[PDB]
Amino acid sequence: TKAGSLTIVGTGIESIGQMTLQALSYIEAAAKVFYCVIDPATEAFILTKNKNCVDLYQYYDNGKSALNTYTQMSELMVREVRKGLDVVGVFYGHPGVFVNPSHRALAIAKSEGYRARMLPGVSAEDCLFADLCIDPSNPGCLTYEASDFLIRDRPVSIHSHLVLFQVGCVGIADFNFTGFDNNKFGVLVDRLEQEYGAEHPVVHYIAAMMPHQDPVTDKYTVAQLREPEIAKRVGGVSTFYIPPKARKASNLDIIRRLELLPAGQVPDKKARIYPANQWEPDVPEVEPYRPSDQAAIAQLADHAPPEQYQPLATSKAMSDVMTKLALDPKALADYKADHRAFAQSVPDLTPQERAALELGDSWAIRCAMKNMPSSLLDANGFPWVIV
Amino acid sequence: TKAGSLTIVGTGIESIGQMTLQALSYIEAAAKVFYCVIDPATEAFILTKNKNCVDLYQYYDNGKSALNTYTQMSELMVREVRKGLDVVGVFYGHPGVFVNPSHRALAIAKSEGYRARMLPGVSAEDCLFADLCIDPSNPGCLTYEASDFLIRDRPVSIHSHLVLFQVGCVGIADFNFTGFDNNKFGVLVDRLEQEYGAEHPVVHYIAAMMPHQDPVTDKYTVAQLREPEIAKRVGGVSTFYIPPKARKASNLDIIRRLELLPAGQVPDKKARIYPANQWEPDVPEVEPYRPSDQAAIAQLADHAPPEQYQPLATSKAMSDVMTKLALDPKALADYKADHRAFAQSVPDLTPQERAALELGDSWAIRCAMKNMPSSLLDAAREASQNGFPWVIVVGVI
Ligand SMILES: C[S@@+](CC[C@H](N)C(=O)[O-])C[C@H]1O[C@@H](n2cnc3c(N)ncnc32)[C@H](O)[C@@H]1O
Ligand SMILES: C[S@@+](CC[C@H](N)C(=O)[O-])C[C@H]1O[C@@H](n2cnc3c(N)ncnc32)[C@H](O)[C@@H]1O
């Protein structure tokens, strides 16, 4: 209703490639773009996509508090929203993951009654999972800012993943163009030694920022982090991953109340699904091809899709319109204003496809796009993860 | 040297738009594509981008263990890798976040000496942060699978964010096409009552899967989750967000070791940085425009970029090649195989740009694309000494 909007989007971590299709489309559509990114290829790429961009990075300065910079960054965006423009703010990675000015600007915009939305992006933690070959679900994940971790004495779990952002700037309030002197780093190492022990592994992680670079995935002991040559390697794009120390056992009361037991059984805490976490100290080898695995693979020769499976059965015209709604913010806005009007103007849709667009309900769109078998409907069927 | 590769990529959560540019380019470049996605528009989109796709979802069945299905899905991918093909597996969201077969397939491919890589994507947790307007950094974030949370008695922190995936299938071991009766949901609700109290908020979160839909961001008390009408709403794509019950105070020893109070002390721990988390119970109003904020804004009129600021100073030819390397997997592989030959054949690069690309060093590329000041070039010679952005979470910093 009110003129003016703020859409905050991400670029991902690795230059250009980790930007989402929707982030790109919003950058292109914006009246004005404000950006804070940390590699020039991504900056150059953004400038090719919109003629009215402002680099927010110029609002940092030596001995200028980060908070004054962030107040300024968010005010530059919100000023343009107040003038009635469709504004896009761009921050590297996920624009809401360890970022101050995005949240400020959106909350101000929202409080003054403008449309305000954050679009998710690929974070450094997303890259971490991908590059270190770990899954937050197994065995759970604790994520902290390193200074907050120390100052608020945040709990660790030795049975779960621990991820620490900003380990290169422990206790730092003021910006500096030649980087952080991280001489309170030893305080973090003290905490890690107390929680995990001197010989426990810490993985120093830096996601590749350019498409041809390898990630840094260097394992050190907690004690090695005290060596000057090693502590020097930790910088402003460094994250630590600390693997679990032990496997947590199962709670017999919950096992009973969930009915996961037929008489006596033995699914051990150390009996793991392949593959095991390679960073975790003293983890045994797990066999990828056990007899049960071999038997499942043997069944592939006789495989047919089951009766209840729903094959895709759509059309070029329907696929085109669903793609357009995802990749054209203008088309989406029109559809959102008037389902019926929009749906009538779409060429080459079948009566079912048109009807389904008119309603906009998930089931109608699903039936138009998937053949639902008879065996299924005599009862929206989803995959999960076993941990 | 060994022929064949496995690249596993995500599609994000919201249909089509949340796919990354690199996920798309790998899908297009693949010899064979294997996918597991949960909306038809994303599925249809994938099929327009590659001619040799296989839907992995057909390997689920009633009375077939999930583990057997996952062994099968991974083996379909790795079989094609062993034949020397560039294979791409595709999973919705981030392909390594609450997903079994991706990790298995990659670990096998890696162990047998094939090129193997996972490309990250946008997870449901990423969507959650964006839609619920929260930052994992403030005040820290614990993320669990709901059944594992109960069975292993995983610890909560009442001072940090808690995110629980798979709240719609508590204790469920068998696959079935017609969904699941979440009959053991009450076991989760008891644990949440124990940890947080009956009146503590729980946010039922479902990210929009189609671009036109709105997310579900429905706040309930723990007690309200016992009502059948409310419990019925929690399904297979439901995640719970539980906000902090209290703010944690600061440690005086660390405040002293980090030298964060020259004057002694201030009088507050809940004098928050704007904005506050609007899901927290009894969160006070935070002032966005304090006198210090107004003073910072007043300085915008006279602002000039500092001397040390590095303006972009590149060329179309350089921007084009860096974009190509990011969006064309074949160009990237060629470049990686021989930096110098690749660099020689790029048209219209300046001598510095060519030299930078020949080396491949990130510092050299940066210096070819930005007008660097002497002081920053001085510091780099005698780890990367650049000012990078950082978040402030602790008010006293
Ligand atoms: C202000 S935050 C911004 C994070 C960003 N919004 C994201 O989505 O990851 C800066 C911190 O993110 C992490 N980070 C940024 N780039 C990284 C990279 N290439 N590899 C590993 N961690 C990184 C580091 O912990 C760094 O101190
Ligand atoms: C097997 S996992 C796969 C997760 C996916 N790889 C990702 O990156 O989020 C399924 C679980 O993810 C979460 N999930 C999936 N889709 C979601 C949505 N649209 N909104 C909220 N949570 C979702 C739910 O917790 C669900 O039970």
Author numbering:
A (entry chain B): 7 to 385, 396 to 403
B (entry chain A): 7 to 388, 393 to 407
Lines from the paper:
While chemical methylation of an amide bond uses a strong base to generate the imidate, OphA, the precursor protein of the fungal peptide macrocycle omphalotin A, self-hypermethylates amides at pH 7 using S-adenosyl methionine (SAM) as cofactor. Omphalotin A derives from the C terminus of the OphA protein, and it is the OphA protein that methylates its own C terminus using S-adenosyl methionine (SAM). The structure of OphA reveals a complex catenane-like arrangement in which the peptide substrate is clamped with its amide nitrogen aligned for nucleophilic attack on the methyl group of SAM. Here, we report the structure of the peptide amide methyltransferase OphA including complexes with cofactor [SAM and S-adenosyl homocysteine (SAH)], cofactor analog, substrate, and product.
Y76F, R72A, R72K, and Y98A were unmethylated even after 3 days of overexpression in E. coli. In the R72A-SAM complex (rmsd of 0.7 Å over 720 Cα atoms with OphAΔC6-SAH), peptide bonds of the substrate residues i−1 and i are flipped 180° relative to the conformation observed in OphAΔC6 and Y63F-SAH. Although the side chain of residue i+1 sits in the same pocket as seen in the OphAΔC6 protein, its backbone has a different hydrogen bond arrangement. Consequently, the amide nitrogen at position i (Trp400) points away from SAM and is no longer aligned for methylation. The flipped peptide results in Arg72 adopting an alternative conformation. Despite the large conformational change in substrate peptide, conformations of other OphAΔC6 residues are essentially unaltered, pointing to rigidity at the active site. We therefore hypothesize that, by disrupting anchoring interactions, the flipped conformation can be adopted to relieve the steric clashes between SAM and the amide that would otherwise occur. We speculate that the flipped conformation of the substrate (seen in R72A, Y98A, and Y76F SAM complex structures) resembles an intermediate arrangement that occurs during translocation.
